[PDB]
Amino acid sequence: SGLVPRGSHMTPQVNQVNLSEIKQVLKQQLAEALYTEESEIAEDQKFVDLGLDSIVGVEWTTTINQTYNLNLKATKLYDYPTLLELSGYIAQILSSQGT
């Protein structure tokens, strides 16, 4: 199951890179980067409320670049403070890498 939430829904055979894929991936990635559980993270909550500091934000932006073979910086963490925003941008890049 590539999307195993705590209590939300799952999706069927989705070969494309859907928003939920990156959002849920980013959740695990955010909770670990903040030394916490995915049980506290929200899709619509600001990373700073989860504990995202300016240092943690700039180092975590690198994890995502490596994860998708992209290039982003701390500017992303300040323009997209939520998983839905952070995932939305990447969704388009991934959905476009395999035109």
Coordinates of all heavy atoms in Angstrom, one line a residue:
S1 N 0.9 -1.2 0.0 CA 0.0 0.0 0.0 C 0.9 1.2 0.0 O 1.5 1.5 1.0 CB -0.9 0.0 1.2 OG -1.8 -1.2 1.2
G2 N 1.1 1.9 -1.1 CA 1.9 3.1 -1.2 C 1.4 4.3 -0.4 O 2.1 5.3 -0.3
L3 N 0.1 4.3 0.0 CA -0.5 5.3 0.8 C -1.2 4.6 1.9 O -2.3 4.1 1.7 CB -1.5 6.1 -0.1 CG -0.9 6.9 -1.2 CD1 -0.9 6.1 -2.5 CD2 -1.6 8.2 -1.4
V4 N -0.7 4.7 3.1 CA -1.3 4.0 4.3 C -1.5 5.1 5.4 O -0.6 5.4 6.2 CB -0.5 2.8 4.7 CG1 1.0 2.9 4.8 CG2 -1.1 2.1 6.0
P5 N -2.6 5.8 5.4 CA -2.9 6.9 6.3 C -3.3 6.3 7.7 O -3.5 5.1 7.9 CB -4.1 7.7 5.7 CG -4.8 6.6 5.0 CD -3.7 5.7 4.5
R6 N -3.4 7.2 8.7 CA -3.8 6.8 10.1 C -5.3 6.6 10.1 O -5.7 5.7 10.9 CB -3.3 7.9 11.1 CG -3.8 9.3 10.9 CD -3.1 10.3 11.8 NE -3.8 11.6 11.8 CZ -3.2 12.8 11.8 NH1 -1.9 12.9 11.7 NH2 -4.0 13.9 11.9
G7 N -6.1 7.3 9.3 CA -7.5 7.2 9.3 C -8.2 7.8 8.0 O -9.4 7.9 8.0
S8 N -7.4 8.3 7.1 CA -8.0 8.9 5.8 C -8.2 7.8 4.8 O -8.2 6.6 5.2 CB -7.0 10.0 5.4 OG -7.5 10.8 4.3
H9 N -8.6 8.1 3.6 CA -8.8 7.1 2.6 C -7.5 6.8 1.8 O -6.6 7.5 1.9 CB -9.9 7.6 1.6 CG -9.4 8.5 0.5 ND1 -9.1 8.1 -0.8 CD2 -9.1 9.8 0.6 CE1 -8.6 9.2 -1.5 NE2 -8.6 10.3 -0.6
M10 N -7.6 5.7 1.1 CA -6.5 5.2 0.2 C -7.0 5.3 -1.2 O -8.2 5.5 -1.4 CB -6.1 3.7 0.6 CG -5.4 3.7 2.0 SD -6.6 3.5 3.4 CE -6.7 1.7 3.4
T11 N -6.1 5.1 -2.2 CA -6.5 5.3 -3.6 C -6.3 3.9 -4.4 O -5.5 3.1 -3.8 CB -5.8 6.5 -4.2 OG1 -6.6 7.3 -4.9 CG2 -4.5 6.2 -5.0
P12 N -6.9 3.7 -5.5 CA -6.8 2.4 -6.3 C -5.5 2.5 -7.2 O -4.6 3.2 -6.9 CB -8.1 2.4 -7.1 CG -8.3 3.9 -7.4 CD -7.8 4.6 -6.2
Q13 N -5.5 1.7 -8.3 CA -4.4 1.7 -9.2 C -4.3 3.1 -9.8 O -5.1 3.5 -10.7 CB -4.4 0.5 -10.2 CG -5.7 0.4 -11.1 CD -5.4 -0.5 -12.3 OE1 -5.9 -1.6 -12.4 NE2 -4.6 0.0 -13.2
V14 N -3.3 3.8 -9.4 CA -3.0 5.2 -9.8 C -1.5 5.1 -10.2 O -0.6 5.1 -9.3 CB -3.3 6.2 -8.7 CG1 -2.8 7.6 -9.0 CG2 -4.9 6.2 -8.5
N15 N -1.2 5.0 -11.5 CA 0.1 4.9 -12.0 C 0.8 6.2 -12.2 O 2.0 6.3 -12.4 CB 0.0 4.2 -13.4 CG 1.4 3.9 -14.0 OD1 1.8 4.4 -15.0 ND2 2.1 3.0 -13.3
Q16 N 0.0 7.3 -12.1 CA 0.5 8.7 -12.2 C 0.9 9.1 -10.8 O 0.5 8.5 -9.8 CB -0.7 9.5 -12.8 CG -1.1 9.1 -14.2 CD -2.4 9.6 -14.7 OE1 -3.3 10.0 -13.9 NE2 -2.7 9.7 -16.0
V17 N 1.5 10.3 -10.8 CA 2.0 10.8 -9.5 C 0.9 11.8 -9.0 O 0.9 13.0 -9.3 CB 3.4 11.3 -9.5 CG1 3.9 11.4 -8.1 CG2 4.3 10.4 -10.3
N18 N -0.1 11.3 -8.3 CA -1.2 12.0 -7.7 C -0.7 12.8 -6.5 O 0.2 12.5 -5.8 CB -2.2 11.0 -7.2 CG -3.3 11.5 -6.3 OD1 -4.0 12.5 -6.6 ND2 -3.4 10.9 -5.1
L19 N -1.5 13.9 -6.2 CA -1.2 14.8 -5.1 C -1.1 14.1 -3.7 O -0.2 14.4 -3.0 CB -2.4 15.8 -4.9 CG -2.0 17.2 -5.3 CD1 -1.0 17.8 -4.3 CD2 -1.6 17.4 -6.8
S20 N -1.9 13.1 -3.5 CA -1.9 12.4 -2.2 C -0.6 11.6 -2.1 O -0.1 11.5 -1.0 CB -3.1 11.4 -2.1 OG -4.3 12.1 -2.4
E21 N 0.0 11.1 -3.2 CA 1.2 10.3 -3.1 C 2.3 11.2 -2.5 O 2.9 10.8 -1.5 CB 1.7 10.0 -4.5 CG 0.8 8.9 -5.2 CD 1.6 8.0 -6.2 OE1 2.4 8.5 -6.9 OE2 1.3 6.8 -6.2
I22 N 2.6 12.4 -3.0 CA 3.6 13.3 -2.5 C 3.2 13.8 -1.2 O 4.0 13.8 -0.3 CB 3.9 14.4 -3.5 CG1 4.0 13.9 -5.0 CG2 5.1 15.2 -3.2 CD1 2.7 14.5 -5.7
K23 N 2.0 14.2 -1.0 CA 1.5 14.7 0.3 C 1.8 13.7 1.4 O 2.4 14.0 2.5 CB 0.1 15.1 0.2 CG -0.6 15.3 1.6 CD -1.5 14.1 1.9 CE -2.9 14.4 1.2 NZ -3.9 13.3 1.6
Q24 N 1.3 12.4 1.3 CA 1.5 11.4 2.3 C 3.0 11.1 2.5 O 3.5 10.8 3.6 CB 0.6 10.2 2.1 CG 1.1 9.1 1.2 CD 2.1 8.1 1.8 OE1 3.1 7.8 1.2 NE2 1.8 7.6 3.0
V25 N 3.8 11.1 1.4 CA 5.2 10.9 1.4 C 5.9 12.0 2.3 O 6.5 11.7 3.3 CB 5.8 10.7 0.0 CG1 7.3 11.1 -0.1 CG2 5.6 9.3 -0.5
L26 N 5.5 13.2 1.9 CA 6.0 14.4 2.6 C 5.6 14.4 4.1 O 6.3 14.9 4.9 CB 5.5 15.7 2.0 CG 6.1 16.1 0.6 CD1 5.3 17.3 0.2 CD2 7.6 16.4 0.7
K27 N 4.5 13.7 4.5 CA 4.1 13.6 5.9 C 5.2 12.8 6.6 O 5.7 13.3 7.6 CB 2.7 13.0 6.1 CG 2.6 12.4 7.5 CD 1.2 12.4 8.0 CE 0.5 11.1 7.8 NZ 0.2 10.7 6.4
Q28 N 5.4 11.6 6.2 CA 6.4 10.8 6.8 C 7.8 11.5 7.0 O 8.3 11.5 8.0 CB 6.6 9.4 6.2 CG 7.6 9.1 5.1 CD 7.7 7.7 4.7 OE1 6.8 7.1 4.0 NE2 8.7 7.0 5.1
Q29 N 8.1 12.2 5.9 CA 9.4 12.9 5.7 C 9.4 14.1 6.7 O 10.5 14.5 7.2 CB 9.5 13.4 4.3 CG 9.6 12.2 3.2 CD 11.0 12.1 2.7 OE1 11.9 11.7 3.3 NE2 11.2 12.4 1.4
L30 N 8.3 14.8 6.9 CA 8.2 15.9 7.8 C 8.2 15.5 9.2 O 9.0 16.0 10.0 CB 6.9 16.7 7.5 CG 6.8 18.1 8.2 CD1 6.2 18.1 9.6 CD2 8.1 18.9 8.1
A31 N 7.5 14.4 9.6 CA 7.5 14.0 11.0 C 8.8 13.5 11.4 O 9.3 13.9 12.5 CB 6.4 12.9 11.2
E32 N 9.5 12.8 10.5 CA 10.9 12.3 10.9 C 11.9 13.5 11.0 O 12.7 13.5 11.8 CB 11.4 11.2 9.9 CG 11.6 11.6 8.5 CD 11.7 10.4 7.5 OE1 12.9 9.9 7.3 OE2 10.7 10.0 6.9
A33 N 11.7 14.5 10.1 CA 12.6 15.7 10.1 C 12.4 16.5 11.3 O 13.3 17.3 11.7 CB 12.3 16.5 8.8
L34 N 11.2 16.4 11.9 CA 10.8 17.1 13.1 C 10.9 16.2 14.4 O 10.4 16.6 15.5 CB 9.4 17.7 13.0 CG 9.2 18.8 11.9 CD1 7.9 19.6 12.2 CD2 10.3 19.7 11.8
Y35 N 11.4 15.0 14.3 CA 11.5 14.0 15.4 C 10.1 13.7 16.0 O 10.0 13.6 17.3 CB 12.5 14.5 16.4 CG 13.9 15.0 16.0 CD1 14.3 16.2 16.5 CD2 14.7 14.2 15.2 CE1 15.7 16.6 16.3 CE2 16.0 14.6 14.9 CZ 16.5 15.8 15.5 OH 17.8 16.2 15.3
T36 N 9.1 13.5 15.3 CA 7.7 13.3 15.8 C 7.0 12.2 15.0 O 7.6 11.5 14.1 CB 6.9 14.6 15.8 OG1 5.9 14.4 16.7 CG2 6.4 15.1 14.5
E37 N 5.8 11.9 15.3 CA 4.9 10.9 14.7 C 4.1 11.5 13.6 O 3.6 12.6 13.7 CB 4.0 10.3 15.7 CG 4.7 9.7 16.9 CD 3.6 9.3 18.0 OE1 3.2 10.2 18.7 OE2 3.1 8.2 18.0
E38 N 3.8 10.7 12.6 CA 2.9 11.0 11.5 C 1.5 11.3 12.1 O 0.6 11.9 11.4 CB 3.0 10.0 10.4 CG 4.5 9.7 10.1 CD 4.6 8.8 8.9 OE1 3.8 8.8 8.0 OE2 5.6 8.0 9.0
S39 N 1.2 10.7 13.2 CA -0.1 10.8 13.9 C -0.4 12.3 14.4 O -1.5 12.6 14.7 CB -0.1 9.9 15.1 OG -0.2 8.5 14.7
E40 N 0.6 13.2 14.3 CA 0.4 14.6 14.7 C 0.3 15.5 13.4 O -0.3 16.6 13.5 CB 1.5 15.0 15.6 CG 2.9 15.4 15.0 CD 3.5 16.6 15.8 OE1 3.1 17.8 15.5 OE2 4.2 16.4 16.8
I41 N 0.9 15.1 12.3 CA 1.0 15.9 11.1 C -0.4 16.0 10.4 O -1.1 15.1 10.3 CB 2.1 15.4 10.2 CG1 3.3 14.8 10.9 CG2 2.5 16.4 9.1 CD1 4.5 15.7 11.2
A42 N -0.6 17.2 9.8 CA -1.8 17.5 9.1 C -1.3 17.9 7.7 O -0.2 18.3 7.5 CB -2.6 18.6 9.7
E43 N -2.2 17.9 6.7 CA -2.0 18.2 5.3 C -2.2 19.6 5.0 O -1.6 20.2 4.0 CB -3.0 17.3 4.5 CG -3.0 15.9 4.9 CD -4.0 15.4 5.9 OE1 -3.8 15.6 7.1 OE2 -4.9 14.6 5.5
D44 N -2.9 20.3 5.8 CA -3.4 21.7 5.8 C -2.8 22.5 7.0 O -3.2 23.7 7.2 CB -4.9 21.7 5.8 CG -5.7 20.7 6.6 OD1 -5.1 20.1 7.6 OD2 -6.8 20.3 6.2
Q45 N -1.9 21.9 7.8 CA -1.3 22.7 9.0 C 0.1 23.1 8.6 O 0.7 22.5 7.8 CB -1.4 21.8 10.2 CG -0.8 22.4 11.5 CD -1.4 21.7 12.7 OE1 -2.5 21.8 13.0 NE2 -0.6 20.8 13.3
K46 N 0.5 24.3 9.1 CA 1.8 24.8 8.8 C 2.9 24.0 9.5 O 2.8 23.8 10.7 CB 1.9 26.3 9.3 CG 0.7 27.1 8.9 CD 0.5 27.3 7.4 CE -1.0 27.3 7.0 NZ -1.6 28.6 7.6
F47 N 3.9 23.6 8.8 CA 5.0 22.9 9.3 C 5.6 23.5 10.6 O 6.0 22.8 11.5 CB 6.1 22.7 8.3 CG 5.7 22.2 6.9 CD1 6.1 22.8 5.7 CD2 5.0 21.0 6.9 CE1 5.8 22.2 4.5 CE2 4.6 20.4 5.7 CZ 5.0 21.1 4.5
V48 N 5.6 24.8 10.7 CA 6.1 25.5 11.9 C 5.3 25.1 13.1 O 6.0 24.9 14.2 CB 6.2 27.0 11.6 CG1 6.9 27.4 10.3 CG2 4.8 27.7 11.6
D49 N 4.0 24.8 13.0 CA 3.2 24.4 14.1 C 3.6 23.0 14.5 O 3.4 22.6 15.7 CB 1.7 24.5 13.8 CG 0.8 24.3 14.9 OD1 0.4 23.1 15.2 OD2 0.3 25.2 15.6
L50 N 4.0 22.2 13.6 CA 4.5 20.8 13.8 C 5.9 20.9 14.5 O 6.3 19.9 15.1 CB 4.5 19.9 12.6 CG 3.2 19.6 11.9 CD1 2.2 18.8 12.8 CD2 2.4 20.8 11.3
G51 N 6.6 22.0 14.4 CA 7.9 22.3 14.9 C 9.0 22.7 13.9 O 10.2 22.7 14.2
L52 N 8.6 23.0 12.7 CA 9.6 23.4 11.6 C 10.2 24.8 11.9 O 9.6 25.8 11.7 CB 8.8 23.4 10.3 CG 9.6 23.3 8.9 CD1 10.3 24.6 8.6 CD2 10.5 22.1 8.8
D53 N 11.5 24.7 12.2 CA 12.3 25.9 12.4 C 13.0 26.3 11.1 O 13.2 25.4 10.3 CB 13.4 25.6 13.4 CG 13.0 25.1 14.8 OD1 12.5 25.8 15.6 OD2 13.3 23.9 15.0
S54 N 13.5 27.5 11.0 CA 14.2 28.0 9.8 C 15.4 27.0 9.4 O 15.7 27.1 8.2 CB 14.8 29.4 10.0 OG 14.9 29.9 8.7
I55 N 16.1 26.4 10.3 CA 17.2 25.5 10.0 C 16.6 24.2 9.5 O 17.0 23.7 8.4 CB 18.1 25.4 11.2 CG1 18.8 26.8 11.5 CG2 19.1 24.3 11.1 CD1 19.5 26.9 12.8
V56 N 15.7 23.6 10.2 CA 15.1 22.4 9.9 C 14.4 22.5 8.5 O 14.5 21.5 7.7 CB 14.1 21.9 11.0 CG1 13.6 20.5 10.7 CG2 14.8 22.0 12.3
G57 N 13.8 23.6 8.1 CA 13.2 23.8 6.9 C 14.2 23.8 5.7 O 13.9 23.2 4.6
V58 N 15.3 24.4 5.8 CA 16.3 24.5 4.8 C 17.0 23.1 4.6 O 17.4 22.8 3.5 CB 17.3 25.6 5.0 CG1 18.2 25.5 6.3 CG2 18.2 25.8 3.9
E59 N 17.2 22.3 5.7 CA 17.8 21.0 5.5 C 16.9 20.0 4.9 O 17.2 19.3 4.0 CB 18.5 20.6 6.8 CG 17.5 20.3 8.0 CD 18.0 19.5 9.1 OE1 19.1 19.9 9.7 OE2 17.4 18.5 9.4
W60 N 15.6 20.1 5.3 CA 14.5 19.2 4.9 C 14.2 19.4 3.4 O 14.0 18.4 2.7 CB 13.3 19.3 5.7 CG 12.2 18.3 5.5 CD1 12.4 17.0 5.4 CD2 10.8 18.5 5.3 NE1 11.2 16.4 5.1 CE2 10.2 17.3 4.9 CE3 10.0 19.7 5.3 CZ2 8.9 17.2 4.5 CZ3 8.7 19.6 4.8 CH2 8.1 18.4 4.4
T61 N 14.3 20.6 2.9 CA 14.1 20.9 1.4 C 15.0 20.0 0.6 O 14.7 19.6 -0.5 CB 14.2 22.4 1.2 OG1 13.3 22.8 0.1 CG2 15.6 22.8 0.8
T62 N 16.2 19.7 1.1 CA 17.2 18.8 0.4 C 16.7 17.4 0.2 O 16.8 16.8 -0.8 CB 18.5 18.9 1.1 OG1 19.0 20.2 1.3 CG2 19.6 18.2 0.3
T63 N 16.1 16.9 1.3 CA 15.6 15.5 1.3 C 14.6 15.2 0.1 O 14.7 14.3 -0.6 CB 14.8 15.2 2.6 OG1 15.6 15.8 3.7 CG2 14.5 13.8 2.9
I64 N 13.7 16.2 -0.1 CA 12.8 16.2 -1.2 C 13.4 16.2 -2.5 O 13.0 15.5 -3.5 CB 11.8 17.3 -1.0 CG1 11.0 17.2 0.3 CG2 10.8 17.5 -2.2 CD1 10.3 18.4 0.7
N65 N 14.5 17.0 -2.7 CA 15.2 17.1 -3.9 C 15.8 15.8 -4.3 O 15.7 15.4 -5.4 CB 16.4 18.1 -3.9 CG 15.9 19.5 -3.6 OD1 14.8 19.9 -3.9 ND2 16.8 20.3 -3.0
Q66 N 16.4 15.2 -3.3 CA 17.0 13.8 -3.5 C 15.9 12.8 -3.8 O 16.1 12.0 -4.7 CB 17.8 13.5 -2.2 CG 18.9 14.5 -1.8 CD 20.1 13.8 -1.2 OE1 20.4 14.0 0.0 NE2 20.8 13.0 -2.0
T67 N 14.8 12.9 -3.1 CA 13.7 12.0 -3.2 C 13.2 12.0 -4.7 O 12.9 10.9 -5.2 CB 12.6 12.3 -2.2 OG1 13.1 12.2 -0.9 CG2 11.4 11.3 -2.3
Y68 N 13.0 13.1 -5.3 CA 12.5 13.3 -6.6 C 13.4 13.6 -7.7 O 13.0 13.7 -8.9 CB 11.3 14.2 -6.6 CG 10.2 13.7 -5.6 CD1 9.9 14.5 -4.4 CD2 9.6 12.5 -5.8 CE1 8.9 14.0 -3.6 CE2 8.6 12.0 -5.0 CZ 8.2 12.8 -3.9 OH 7.1 12.4 -3.1
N69 N 14.7 13.8 -7.4 CA 15.8 14.2 -8.3 C 15.6 15.6 -8.9 O 15.7 15.8 -10.1 CB 16.0 13.1 -9.4 CG 17.5 12.9 -9.7 OD1 18.3 13.7 -9.5 ND2 17.8 11.8 -10.3
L70 N 15.1 16.5 -8.0 CA 14.8 17.9 -8.3 C 15.7 18.9 -7.7 O 16.8 18.5 -7.2 CB 13.3 18.2 -7.9 CG 12.3 17.2 -8.6 CD1 10.9 17.5 -8.2 CD2 12.5 17.2 -10.1
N71 N 15.4 20.2 -7.7 CA 16.1 21.3 -7.1 C 15.1 22.3 -6.6 O 14.4 23.0 -7.3 CB 17.0 21.9 -8.2 CG 17.6 23.2 -7.6 OD1 17.9 23.3 -6.4 ND2 17.8 24.3 -8.4
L72 N 15.2 22.4 -5.2 CA 14.4 23.3 -4.4 C 15.2 23.8 -3.3 O 16.3 23.3 -3.0 CB 13.2 22.5 -3.8 CG 12.3 21.7 -4.8 CD1 11.5 20.7 -4.1 CD2 11.5 22.6 -5.7
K73 N 14.8 24.8 -2.6 CA 15.5 25.5 -1.5 C 14.5 25.8 -0.4 O 13.3 25.5 -0.5 CB 16.3 26.6 -2.0 CG 15.9 27.5 -3.2 CD 15.8 28.9 -2.8 CE 17.1 29.6 -2.4 NZ 17.9 29.9 -3.6
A74 N 15.0 26.5 0.7 CA 14.2 26.9 1.8 C 13.0 27.8 1.4 O 12.0 27.8 2.1 CB 15.0 27.7 2.8
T75 N 13.1 28.5 0.2 CA 12.1 29.3 -0.3 C 10.8 28.5 -0.4 O 9.7 29.0 -0.1 CB 12.5 29.9 -1.6 OG1 11.8 31.1 -2.0 CG2 12.4 29.0 -2.8
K76 N 10.9 27.2 -0.7 CA 9.7 26.4 -0.8 C 9.0 26.3 0.5 O 7.7 26.4 0.6 CB 10.0 24.9 -1.3 CG 10.3 24.8 -2.8 CD 9.2 25.3 -3.7 CE 9.5 26.6 -4.3 NZ 8.5 27.2 -5.2
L77 N 9.7 26.0 1.6 CA 9.2 25.9 3.0 C 8.5 27.2 3.5 O 7.7 27.1 4.4 CB 10.3 25.5 3.9 CG 10.5 23.9 4.0 CD1 9.3 23.3 4.7 CD2 10.7 23.3 2.6
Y78 N 8.8 28.3 2.8 CA 8.2 29.6 3.2 C 7.1 30.0 2.3 O 6.3 30.9 2.6 CB 9.3 30.6 3.3 CG 10.1 30.6 4.6 CD1 11.4 30.1 4.6 CD2 9.5 30.9 5.8 CE1 12.1 30.0 5.8 CE2 10.2 30.8 7.0 CZ 11.5 30.3 7.0 OH 12.2 30.2 8.2
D79 N 6.9 29.3 1.1 CA 5.8 29.6 0.2 C 4.7 28.6 0.3 O 3.6 28.9 0.0 CB 6.4 29.6 -1.3 CG 6.6 31.1 -1.7 OD1 5.7 31.9 -1.9 OD2 7.8 31.4 -1.9
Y80 N 5.1 27.4 0.7 CA 4.2 26.2 0.8 C 4.5 25.6 2.2 O 5.2 24.6 2.3 CB 4.6 25.2 -0.3 CG 4.5 25.7 -1.7 CD1 5.5 25.4 -2.6 CD2 3.5 26.6 -2.1 CE1 5.6 25.9 -3.9 CE2 3.6 27.2 -3.4 CZ 4.6 26.9 -4.3 OH 4.6 27.5 -5.5
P81 N 4.0 26.2 3.3 CA 4.1 25.7 4.6 C 3.3 24.4 4.9 O 3.3 24.0 6.1 CB 3.7 26.8 5.5 CG 2.6 27.5 4.6 CD 3.1 27.4 3.2
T82 N 2.5 23.9 4.0 CA 1.7 22.7 4.2 C 2.0 21.6 3.2 O 2.6 21.9 2.1 CB 0.1 23.0 4.2 OG1 -0.3 23.2 2.8 CG2 -0.3 24.3 5.0
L83 N 1.7 20.4 3.6 CA 2.0 19.2 2.7 C 1.2 19.3 1.4 O 1.7 19.0 0.4 CB 1.5 17.9 3.4 CG 2.2 17.5 4.7 CD1 1.5 16.2 5.2 CD2 3.7 17.2 4.5
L84 N 0.0 19.9 1.4 CA -0.8 20.0 0.2 C -0.2 21.0 -0.8 O -0.3 20.8 -2.0 CB -2.3 20.4 0.6 CG -3.0 19.2 1.3 CD1 -4.4 19.7 1.8 CD2 -3.2 18.0 0.4
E85 N 0.4 22.0 -0.3 CA 1.0 23.0 -1.1 C 2.4 22.5 -1.6 O 2.6 22.5 -2.8 CB 1.2 24.4 -0.4 CG -0.2 24.9 -0.1 CD -0.2 26.5 0.0 OE1 0.3 27.0 1.0 OE2 -0.8 27.1 -0.8
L86 N 3.2 22.0 -0.7 CA 4.5 21.4 -1.0 C 4.4 20.3 -2.0 O 5.2 20.2 -2.9 CB 5.2 21.0 0.3 CG 6.7 21.1 0.3 CD1 7.3 22.5 0.3 CD2 7.4 20.3 1.4
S87 N 3.3 19.4 -1.8 CA 3.1 18.3 -2.7 C 2.6 18.8 -4.1 O 3.0 18.2 -5.1 CB 2.1 17.3 -2.2 OG 0.9 17.9 -1.7
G88 N 1.7 19.8 -4.1 CA 1.1 20.3 -5.4 C 2.2 20.7 -6.4 O 2.1 20.3 -7.5
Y89 N 3.2 21.4 -6.0 CA 4.2 21.9 -6.9 C 5.0 20.7 -7.4 O 5.1 20.6 -8.7 CB 5.1 22.9 -6.1 CG 6.3 23.4 -7.0 CD1 6.0 23.8 -8.3 CD2 7.6 23.4 -6.5 CE1 7.1 24.2 -9.1 CE2 8.6 23.8 -7.3 CZ 8.4 24.1 -8.7 OH 9.5 24.4 -9.5
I90 N 5.4 19.8 -6.6 CA 6.2 18.6 -7.0 C 5.3 17.7 -7.8 O 5.9 17.1 -8.8 CB 6.7 17.9 -5.7 CG1 7.5 18.8 -4.7 CG2 7.6 16.7 -6.1 CD1 7.7 18.1 -3.4
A91 N 4.0 17.5 -7.6 CA 3.1 16.7 -8.3 C 3.2 17.0 -9.8 O 3.3 16.1 -10.6 CB 1.6 16.9 -7.9
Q92 N 3.2 18.3 -10.2 CA 3.3 18.7 -11.6 C 4.6 18.4 -12.2 O 4.7 17.9 -13.3 CB 3.1 20.3 -11.7 CG 1.7 20.7 -11.1 CD 0.6 19.9 -11.7 OE1 0.4 19.7 -12.9 NE2 -0.2 19.3 -10.8
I93 N 5.7 18.5 -11.5 CA 7.1 18.2 -12.0 C 7.1 16.7 -12.2 O 7.5 16.3 -13.3 CB 8.2 18.7 -11.0 CG1 8.0 20.1 -10.5 CG2 9.5 18.5 -11.6 CD1 8.9 20.5 -9.3
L94 N 6.7 15.9 -11.3 CA 6.7 14.4 -11.4 C 5.8 14.0 -12.5 O 6.2 13.1 -13.3 CB 6.3 13.7 -10.1 CG 7.5 13.8 -9.0 CD1 6.9 13.6 -7.6 CD2 8.6 12.8 -9.3
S95 N 4.6 14.5 -12.6 CA 3.6 14.2 -13.6 C 4.1 14.6 -15.0 O 3.7 14.0 -16.0 CB 2.2 14.8 -13.3 OG 2.1 16.2 -13.4
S96 N 5.1 15.6 -15.1 CA 5.7 16.1 -16.3 C 7.0 15.4 -16.7 O 7.3 15.3 -17.8 CB 5.8 17.6 -16.2 OG 6.1 18.2 -17.5
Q97 N 7.7 14.8 -15.7 CA 9.0 14.1 -16.0 C 8.7 12.9 -16.9 O 9.6 12.5 -17.7 CB 9.6 13.5 -14.7 CG 10.4 14.6 -13.9 CD 11.7 14.9 -14.6 OE1 11.7 15.6 -15.7 NE2 12.9 14.6 -14.1
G98 N 7.5 12.3 -16.9 CA 7.1 11.2 -17.7 C 6.0 11.7 -18.5 O 4.8 11.3 -18.2
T99 N 6.2 12.6 -19.5 CA 5.2 13.1 -20.3 C 4.7 12.0 -21.2 O 5.3 11.5 -22.1 CB 5.8 14.2 -21.2 OG1 6.7 15.1 -20.5 CG2 4.7 15.1 -21.9

